[model samples]
Target: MSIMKVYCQICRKGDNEELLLLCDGCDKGCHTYCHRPKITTIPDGDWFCPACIAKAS
Candidate 1:
């Protein structure tokens, strides 16, 4: 499997912290540790960070 570089969906900035997950809501890359959930458990389908998710509504 090829490792894909993670970039922030909101700003399109590369994740310098080496996060391995992408936000479904904004399609941005972020460090799992640094990721904050807007809701509980970040939801299984269509997830977003606390900030983006808040703005979505």
Candidate 2:
């Protein structure tokens, strides 16, 4: 398996302590528990947290 480095969308900084998927729009890292306001499913093989998704809407 390949490991992808996910960075904080807002801060644009990678938090090595946490591994989370961010949205391409807003760019923010969100933990699993923090994930909310489900945005459109990333069918393009992309991952979006929640805040960014909400912002897009």
Candidate 3:
């Protein structure tokens, strides 16, 4: 079986991770460790990356 590589938008690197930060807006993602804020679970609502926010504008 082939494993999928996790691409982090913040670092712009493709690597591997069991869990990564998934943006609810654009449906893109980054590693929590790589994100500037290094996000944890967003139990409140949706999460969007920097680009996603800019893109919304």
Candidate achieving the largest lDDT: 3
Model 3 Cα lDDT, one tens digit per residue, 1-57 = 997555777686766453466678776778767766766654355567778789789
Q: Provide the TM-score for each candidate, comma-separated.
A: 0.39, 0.35, 0.47
42 Cα displacement, candidate 3 (Å): 4.3
Candidate 1 ranges with C-alpha deviation above 4 Å: 1-4, 8-19, 36-46
In order, candidate lDDTs are: 0.56, 0.52, 0.67
> Candidate 2 on 1-57: residue-level lDDT in tens?
997776654455665433455555655565443335533343346665455557679
- Going through the candidates in the order shown, the clash numbers are 1, 3, 0
The TM-score measured for candidate 3 stands at 0.47
**Largest TM-score belongs to which candidate?**
3
Tens-digit lDDT track of model 1 for 5-44? 7775445667454343566666666655444542224334
Error of 3 at 35 (Å): 1.2
Q: Model 2 misses residue 44 by how many Å?
A: 8.7
RMSD of each: 6.2, 7.6, 4.4
- Candidate 3 regions with alpha-carbon error over 4 angstroms: 1-6, 10-19, 40-43
Better of 1 and 3 by TM-score: 3
Between prediction 1 and prediction 2, the one with superior lDDT is 1
